[PDB]
Amino acid sequence: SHMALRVGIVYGTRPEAIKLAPLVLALDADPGFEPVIITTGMLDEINELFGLRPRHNLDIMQRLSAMASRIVGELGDPLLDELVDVAVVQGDTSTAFAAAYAAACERIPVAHLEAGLRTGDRFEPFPEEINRRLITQLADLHFAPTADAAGNLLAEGVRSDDVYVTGNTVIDAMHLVLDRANRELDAFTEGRQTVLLTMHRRESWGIPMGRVAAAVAELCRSRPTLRFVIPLHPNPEVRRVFRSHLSSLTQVLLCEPLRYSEFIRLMHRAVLVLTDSGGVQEEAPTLGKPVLVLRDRTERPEGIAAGCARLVGTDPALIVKEVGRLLDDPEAYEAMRVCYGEGDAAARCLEALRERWLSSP
Amino acid sequence: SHMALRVGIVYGTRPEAIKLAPLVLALDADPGFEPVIITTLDEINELFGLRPRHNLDIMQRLSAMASRIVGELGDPLLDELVDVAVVQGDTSTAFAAAYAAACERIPVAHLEAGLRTGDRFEPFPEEINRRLITQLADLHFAPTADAAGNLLAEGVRSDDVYVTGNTVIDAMHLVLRELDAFTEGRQTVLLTMHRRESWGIPMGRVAAAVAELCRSRPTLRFVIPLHPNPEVRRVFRSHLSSLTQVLLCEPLRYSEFIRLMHRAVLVLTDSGGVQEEAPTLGKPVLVLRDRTERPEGIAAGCARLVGTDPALIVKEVGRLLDDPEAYEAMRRPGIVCYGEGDAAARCLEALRERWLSSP
Amino acid sequence: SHMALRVGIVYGTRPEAIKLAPLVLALDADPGFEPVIITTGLDEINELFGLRPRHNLDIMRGQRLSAMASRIVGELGDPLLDELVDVAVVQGDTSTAFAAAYAAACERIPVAHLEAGLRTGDRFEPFPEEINRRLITQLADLHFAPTADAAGNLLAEGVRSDDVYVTGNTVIDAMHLVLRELDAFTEGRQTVLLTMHRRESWGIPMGRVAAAVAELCRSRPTLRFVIPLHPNPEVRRVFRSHLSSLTQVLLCEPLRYSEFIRLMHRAVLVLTDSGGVQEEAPTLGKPVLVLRDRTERPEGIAAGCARLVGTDPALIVKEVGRLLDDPEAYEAMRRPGIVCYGEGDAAARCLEALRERWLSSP
Amino acid sequence: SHMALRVGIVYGTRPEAIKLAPLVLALDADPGFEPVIITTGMLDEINELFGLRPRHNLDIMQRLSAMASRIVGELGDPLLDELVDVAVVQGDTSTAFAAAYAAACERIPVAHLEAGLRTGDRFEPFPEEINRRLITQLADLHFAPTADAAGNLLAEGVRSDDVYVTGNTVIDAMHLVLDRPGDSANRELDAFTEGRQTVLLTMHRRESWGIPMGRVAAAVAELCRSRPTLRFVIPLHPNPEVRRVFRSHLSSLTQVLLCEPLRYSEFIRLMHRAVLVLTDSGGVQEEAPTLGKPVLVLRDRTERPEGIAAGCARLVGTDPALIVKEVGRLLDDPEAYEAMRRPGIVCYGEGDAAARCLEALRERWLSSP
Ligand SMILES: O=c1ccn([C@@H]2O[C@H](COP(=O)(O)OP(=O)(O)O[C@H]3O[C@H](CO)[C@@H](O)[C@H](O)[C@H]3O)[C@@H](O)[C@H]2O)c(=O)[nH]1
Ligand SMILES: O=c1ccn([C@@H]2O[C@H](COP(=O)(O)OP(=O)(O)O[C@H]3O[C@H](CO)[C@@H](O)[C@H](O)[C@H]3O)[C@@H](O)[C@H]2O)c(=O)[nH]1
Ligand SMILES: O=c1ccn([C@@H]2O[C@H](COP(=O)(O)OP(=O)(O)O[C@H]3O[C@H](CO)[C@@H](O)[C@H](O)[C@H]3O)[C@@H](O)[C@H]2O)c(=O)[nH]1
Ligand SMILES: O=c1ccn([C@@H]2O[C@H](COP(=O)(O)OP(=O)(O)O[C@H]3O[C@H](CO)[C@@H](O)[C@H](O)[C@H]3O)[C@@H](O)[C@H]2O)c(=O)[nH]1
Ligand code: NA
Ligand code: NA
Ligand code: NA
Ligand code: NA
């Protein structure tokens, strides 16, 4: 019956759910807080695995203006009905931005989980890069995964007292599933060098993804003992490009999206990871897996500077060369093996929330 | 199978539900009547065993809300074959529902009729709501002789006014672990504060008075169940959340709230209902307003106005904790302000006399 | 360019328009004020007095009271805010007057009530007009009472004396402003003017009144009646089916206000259930027989200007006979010199009350 | 038939229309550009005076979330239908924010007129202070009125090449009406002010409604009682609550002329005749010093710190004793008066801001390497 700080948790996507799950679990266990989940949008599967129970699903997530209009227009009512005291948004989504704005309209304070990631390339990608900069102005409190991300927030006028370097909750999430099976994946990878590849970014759809698929095909032809596992993003155009280039190759296992527990176990077994995923750039180095990044830019410069990760873009010759170097030269491999925190990020977020909103002078 | 007088019961809020619950229970138990509940709260419904036949999901601009109730309440009143409609208190629901009932020529009774400050449109719209309901209602259940006098001054005929007392006393009587652990062996002040006209700075001054009293009196405790509004929660939380002597609470179930009030040494409130409940438990009340609709407790010395002046609140709480003669002067037995706890039965007999009789 | 008090004027019916017209004209002429008309429902009355509505809400019509009141409460706020209304005036006893007063109160726009304090003392009779007056009375900051009796009714409902002004009735102002087939029909004959519209008298009671007209016509070959019919098909049908063959009765369409007042001036007496005609007819020295069991104009009853006759055909025949046959009974129902309902300066008295309340500082 | 850069101009209010009008006129006159006006929201009167012709009026206007939702949802269609290339928004309005976002959603680049004004008080006022910081992240180009405002933009991570110190277009707007004596005349205002010391007062901010405005009105009443020769002209913001507070405190005082909103030409002429100006208006803080009129600011904070630092303006809040004292000092002591008009500093620009905006637009969007 003691007053709990009621913390709104608003997300629409898998990566948001994975990164918020450890914060939800910490808020649930602590008697000083009550998490209240509102979804805007694979997700049931993540909710089941971590035991997340949404109070409300807005069935909103299509033109960007129409989607943002609906969230700005409609999120206020459930936030008020659920007596939310403070709202947490995560990452770079149009949900995170529109929900932060909707919360601000009701004078509900906002906290941003995973604050301060920047490429320095204006509107690239769109709208994610501008979403971060808008959320940054709306948020009272910022949970930065790294010192570099905290620096980016100060350069946009955020006061140092509003910034906590908590590390990234994705490390917490990884640790939760590492201390907890898939027959077909085990049978396919057992006793083989397996490359794990994920690729989903809209700016790479069609021809650039086709080049990456051609690089995979070439590596498979040249290296009969090499295997690839490619869990496919749930978009029909992404599935069609990989399927049409690779479905006949016995050395490639094209997969449905994997449950996070199975995905992390697979990543642990992989010899290296090719990805355009932000989260996988954080997860893979933590498991000592070299990462080749299928983009021209990254929001994770820490991995680049430490030699954990290299940019490879969608150039098939460079991908073939760089994967070859790592498989053939054990010194190049070892040169690519904490950037993103220790796995206590949820507890550091909780203590920042308690200090800001459960304290009086 | 004998004809029952079907009594519409319309409310949208906790205070209405608490005050109507004893009337609903009396109507349910009496074979001459059938209560029909329409809402415009689940926890209060569960506690008293109230089962709404219809929930209109209406409760935003005042004009839009009143428009919806006037427009939409008629259909469920007609569908449920309501004979007579009861509304309670001062809400825009009570006013708009009384009007919607009048439009269908359904006679209206007003529970807790005739409370006045004498300050026009203060608060708005509650003060005007009472005066509009007063003209719409055929029958008025006044809690006190003073309230009956206010009805006569607005042209209500004496035969349409019954001094029933307040059903909140009935409600208290019906309901009579972390809270126990926090209060056991300590002087505990119970504080509630919710009025829109006190939001922000005035509530901040009251919270500062609490902080000062806590610093000066290490043995003093406060329990503050917070009104479910984020701005109210924010002011108390930001002023008091670090003070070990203050337990900030979620809204309490009515049974738990009344038990806490019984254990408290005194009550600070801007609540109308708590001004009626606290004196009935012999707890001195300091009223966190510049006006009250409960002048009876003021006149009898049960209650004193303190407003949102932190110096006056500190002084007045100090007087009661330090001077046992000042304390006893606010509990003197013998004078009954708000009724005996038989208000539901007196309402039922007024309903039977008016609408279950023939000349 | 000096600030004007912007006065909302809200009405939906002929009687409201007639009684508000002199106040609108006074507000228009005075530089301290700007009238803003919003209608809920009349072109003919607007043309005659030069009233120009800024907004017509197309709300009124066969419609439920709750649906109409819901629409006015819901929708009148927007034009009141858009037109920057400072204060709102409503008139009389209509559901428009009540719902508009409430809509204005919701936007914290102060309300004034023109023709405040009329009471029968019969609860919900008629419905909803009697309750509308008592609701408007609680909502209004300022009350323009036509008579001392009406002011007394307001004090008995808890209104402070400082909020009540005895202005008289603006219908006298309206009459004074307006002061061929009808001429051809009435020339050389004693003509009774009859109007009857009240919903509580529809069907059988109106049929009894029509039978009384028929009986008077049969017994008095020289007597004529002119009956302008309220625009309701049921009212038209009852009079038409009882009287359309009688050469002594002219059933009429509603008359323009100027023509109606001229006809009333020519009439020997008036039979009506109209509130306004009970005020207009005595001012022209015409005895009034009131086709109701109650009146909100007790002043005319007490002064002998008017008598209640209800819908009893024997009583109507008797009372009309007495007035036509006995010039002493006729003269007893005329009081030239003395005024029941005001002097025809009610608009100016309203304006000065508005200036005192809302265009003054301590 | 040569391609013009089609520049969307979106506003809903008088202050926006006044500050955008000189940019619209410069875009209209230059053959390289075509202004396209879309309104969201007194305004006809400003449109007539400057010859602004809106292509679309949205009639949106109420809860902030509902209004912002409607602009984000519905402004895209007219922007696309009118083939807008670039969008300009002005100031701190929820229209400016929601329109900038709606433009960004259609990949229409945004320029912000009057960029970089800051109090340093988070969410004060709400939502204007956050609107500026959101527009700042959305806009590709920023027209800062002062070097101080440009400094505030760089501290929020704006690249120097995206910030131009143009000055404030309100000075351009003033200059456009100063040249028009015939249109600036008003019989009743002339009769009231001719041969008298006249104080001009405007006050509209929501955070001052009710009690604070009442204190300001009491200060006016006290100054009037103490100084029988003093006059006040108070054009009232079109809000019934604002009108009621001034009317109920001042309507009987022959020394106070309460007015309907004045046409901008007449308002600037009145300000030129006034001995001093009391205001919570942003624009009047910029206009008054340009006419050499000391300004007392009826707020606890300002986004025009330049006028405070240069001694052109002083914060007076809504404290009636301080207002009476400060107005008294300026009327009674010609040295105190002259200290608030000292020459040697131009705070808000020279009245060439529209031309500097145009040249920034051409360099950014009408150039190839
Ligand atoms: O079959 C799969 C594939 C991936 N993952 C997990 O999914 C996450 C990443 O999902 P993805 O859709 O690839 O999104 P990201 O690109 O990682 O995330 C973007 O969106 C996030 C939310 O806005 C931001 O935090 C990031 O910075 C941004 O890169 C990682 O934790 C993976 O382990 C699975 O569980 N199963
Ligand atoms: O944590 C809490 C706090 C209060 N209460 C009860 O809630 C009621 C008071 O509710 P509150 O929201 O404070 O409203 P009031 O101020 O009491 O009531 C207003 O509204 C009522 C309905 O219109 C009117 O009868 C009153 O005169 C008017 O003051 C009382 O019965 C309390 O015992 C609880 O059960 N739990
Ligand atoms: O052909 C006709 C008949 C009547 N009238 C005039 O119409 C008005 C009366 O209209 P009516 O429809 O009879 O309404 P009333 O019964 O007079 O008015 C009711 O409605 C008004 C507004 O609510 C209240 O002021 C009254 O007290 C109430 O009785 C009077 O001024 C008449 O002179 C005409 O102009 N032409
Ligand atoms: O009767 C009058 C009174 C004022 N004005 C003019 O109106 C403008 C002021 O408008 P106002 O409504 O007082 O708004 P401001 O407070 O000046 O403007 C706010 O809103 C603008 C748009 O977001 C921002 O540029 C400003 O920083 C912000 O302070 C000025 O140019 C005045 O000269 C008139 O034309 N007539
Ligand atoms: Na918890
Ligand atoms: Na029963
Ligand atoms: Na006028
Ligand atoms: Na041009």
UniProtKB/TrEMBL annotation, chain A:
It is an enzyme of class 5 (isomerase). GO terms for molecular function: nucleotide binding; UDP-N-acetylglucosamine 2-epimerase activity. Its EC number is 5.1.3.14. UDP-alpha-D-glucose binds at residues 14, 19, 90, 92, 114, 132, 200-201, 258, 263, 277-279, 283, 299-300. It comes from the Bacteria. Residues 26-353 form the UDP-N-acetylglucosamine 2-epimerase domain. Keywords: Isomerase, Nucleotide-binding. Gene3D superfamilies: Glycogen Phosphorylase B. PANTHER family: UDP-N-ACETYLGLUCOSAMINE 2-EPIMERASE. Belongs to the UDP-N-acetylglucosamine 2-epimerase family. This is UDP-N-acetylglucosamine 2-epimerase (non-hydrolyzing). The gene is kasQ.
Automatic annotation (TrEMBL), chain D:
GO terms for molecular function: nucleotide binding; UDP-N-acetylglucosamine 2-epimerase activity. InterPro entries: UDP_GlcNAc_Epimerase_2_dom, WecB-like. Coiled coil: none annotated. Its EC number is 5.1.3.14. It holds the Pfam family Epimerase_2. UDP binds at R14, H204, L262, F267, S281, G282, G283, E287. Keywords: Isomerase, Nucleotide-binding. Residues 26-361 form the UDP-N-acetylglucosamine 2-epimerase domain. It is an enzyme of class 5 (isomerase). Belongs to the UDP-N-acetylglucosamine 2-epimerase family. This is UDP-N-acetylglucosamine 2-epimerase (non-hydrolyzing). The lineage of its organism: Bacteria, Bacillati, Actinomycetota, Actinomycetes, Kitasatosporales. The gene is kasQ.
